[PDB]
Each structure stands twice: as C-alpha cells, then as structure tokens.
Amino acid sequence: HGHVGADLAALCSEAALQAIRKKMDLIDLEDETIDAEVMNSLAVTMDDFRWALSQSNPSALRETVVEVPQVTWEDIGGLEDVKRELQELVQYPVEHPDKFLKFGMTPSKGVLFYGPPGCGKTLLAKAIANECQAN
Amino acid sequence: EFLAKMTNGFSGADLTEICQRACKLAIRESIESEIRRERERQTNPSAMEVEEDDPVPEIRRDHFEEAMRFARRSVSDNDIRKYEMFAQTLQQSRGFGDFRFPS
Amino acid sequence: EFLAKMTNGFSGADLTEICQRACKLAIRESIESEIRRERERQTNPSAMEVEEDDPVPEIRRDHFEEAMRFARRSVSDNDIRKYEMFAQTLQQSRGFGDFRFPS
C-alpha cells in the first residue's frame, strides 16, 4: 500500500538483484567473465519478494486514497432498520433519480451516527459504499 | 384544513418536515411496488400488464396519517415566554395612557 | 454460538481482541513446542521424526477457554444510559400520538 509504479519497478529490480546476490556461490571471483549458465537459469522466488518488500522500499504516500471498499453487508449482521434507512438515504437517490423527480422530493445530504466507542462505525459506513459501488 | 387546526404549537420549520417525510414514506412504497412486479414468479408474456399500473401515482391519505406519527414541536413553552418577556422589556405603550387635548 | 450468547454486554471492539489473544496464546505454545524438538537430548538419527509433527496446526479449544479469562467489557452501564438519555432528548415520536382523518 502506498507504492507507485516507479516504486514497483524498483521493487522488481531489487528482488532480481537479491536473487542474483544469493547466487554468489556460482558467480565467483575466480570466474570474472560469467558463463552463460546463471544468465538464463535463475528464477526469483517468493521470499525474495518478501525480503525486498520488507527490508527496503519506504512508500512515498501520505495523503488520502479514493477507492471502493470490499466489506460486505453480512460482515455485520443485524441492524435491519439501519440498513433500510441507509438504503433509503443512499441507494434510492442514485439508483432511481427519476422517481425523486416525479414529486419533487429533494434528497438529504448526510446522516450523523452516534453510539458507544467501537461498535463498528467505520465498518458500517464502508458497507453502503461497497454496496452502491461508490467511492 | 383538518391538518391545519390539529397542529397547534408547531413552528414553521416543523410542518415543512412532514411534507417531506410523507414524500419519503410514499417513495419507499413506490420503490417497493416495483420490486415485486419485476420479481414475478414465472414471468410469462401471458396476462402481462402492458399498461403501467402506477400503484402510487400520487401521495395518498394514509401516508400523511402515518408520517404524522413522528411529528415533534421544536419550540417549547419555556422559550416562547422568553420572547414574551423581551416584548415586555419594551415598555409597550404603557404609562399614562389616554389623554385629550383641551377645548 | 456458545461463545455468542455467553458474551452479553461486550462491545464490538472487545471481542475482536480475544480472537487475537487466543492467537497469541497459541503462537506461544507453537513456538515453545519447537524448542524441545530441536533441544532433544542425544539428538540421534535413530527414531527421527522425518514428518513434521505439527503439534499446533490450528487454534484448539482450550486456547479460547484460557484466553476468555482475560476478557473485560469496556462500556459500563452508566454510559450506555447516556446514549439512552440523549435518545430521549430527541422527542421520539411522542405527543398526540394516533389520530385519524375524518370520513
């Protein structure tokens, strides 16, 4: 998370260099000119990638990120009234914008949750964003 | 008019809310009525409603009869007395009262 | 389900902690089981476990039975009443109640 395309190019080059560097047993000092064996018979494995991700590459990202969430409605069951209310306040002004125009009811612009700390507030707020395919 | 003299102490910003709550309560049923009509089991071309049935063409009576149940007056009696008392802080044409010019 | 109806007043952020405390209590034993297996006295090739024995392949039952002992509800009863009282500060469809349109 936070990597950009150039950072991922750097990740690929460093993982390939780590796969070279583990093969110094054949890439020796006695063979200054490297034979054509390891030039085409070296494949990178997964822990090299995990090393290159872990040991290096700080991400150059600190600002916000826009995306669709991947949490689902059954991730937090129950609260059918709240689900019905959020469907009425989010889904219907975007899925059916003409019926809101038949008799002129304007949509509302926001709710205010309140409750005890840590009862899945953000995990409830992302669910309707995922369901509407909304950022 | 029957809705007029029932709401007695309601502010002007409170009864403008129930004519959107009734619209929301009718838009819910007009969305819901379209769910079963497309989710007809064995949706066959036989006996098909070629005309739009329009179950909720307009806001009916029981929408207001149900939307009224969530009504609440915003201003109390204790704060309208604050404005009555400030109206009394203006002297309000009080004092000597009627007098007449001599003849 | 037996773990569901036992935890009654637990917030959503408290029972998400015990499914990491149980993981920590099983990772401790899975680290510890590998200590004696490499620290076998006279570690000979005779009767060697060529297969991985895997003593803790998954979280067993007594890990949750022991991790539950450190559970604690975060929210009290005195502060959920604060939200019940704020819910009562909203007038909550109270007043006149049911009325009907004339016929």
UniProtKB/Swiss-Prot annotation, chains B, C:
Phosphoserine modifications at: 30, 98, 103
Disulfide bonds: none
Span list, region Disordered: 36-55
Subcellular location: Cytoplasm, Cytosol; Endoplasmic reticulum; Nucleus; Cytoplasm, Stress granule
Domain of life of the organism encoding this protein: Eukaryota
Chain positions with N6-acetyllysine modification: 82
Post-translational modification: Phosphorylated by tyrosine kinases in response to T-cell antigen receptor activation. Phosphorylated in mitotic cells. ISGylated.
Recorded domain comment: The PIM (PUB-interaction motif) motif mediates interaction with the PUB domain of RNF31.
Assembly: Homohexamer. Forms a ring-shaped particle of 12.5 nm diameter, that displays 6-fold radial symmetry. Part of a ternary complex containing STX5A, NSFL1C and VCP. NSFL1C forms a homotrimer that binds to one end of a VCP homohexamer. The complex binds to membranes enriched in phosphatidylethanolamine-containing lipids and promotes Golgi membrane fusion. Binds to a heterodimer of NPLOC4 and UFD1, binding to this heterodimer inhibits Golgi-membrane fusion. Interaction with VCIP135 leads to dissociation of the complex via ATP hydrolysis by VCP.
Family affiliation: Belongs to the AAA ATPase family.
Disease per record: Inclusion body myopathy with early-onset Paget disease with or without frontotemporal dementia 1: An autosomal dominant disease characterized by disabling muscle weakness clinically resembling to limb girdle muscular dystrophy, osteolytic bone lesions consistent with Paget disease, and premature frontotemporal dementia. Clinical features show incomplete penetrance.
Function in brief: Necessary for the fragmentation of Golgi stacks during mitosis and for their reassembly after mitosis. Involved in the formation of the transitional endoplasmic reticulum (tER). The transfer of membranes from the endoplasmic reticulum to the Golgi apparatus occurs via 50-70 nm transition vesicles which derive from part-rough, part-smooth transitional elements of the endoplasmic reticulum (tER). Vesicle budding from the tER is an ATP-dependent process.
Protein name: Transitional endoplasmic reticulum ATPase
Organism annotation: Homo sapiens
Species classification: Eukaryota, Metazoa, Chordata, Craniata, Vertebrata
Full-sequence range covered: 673 to 775 of 806
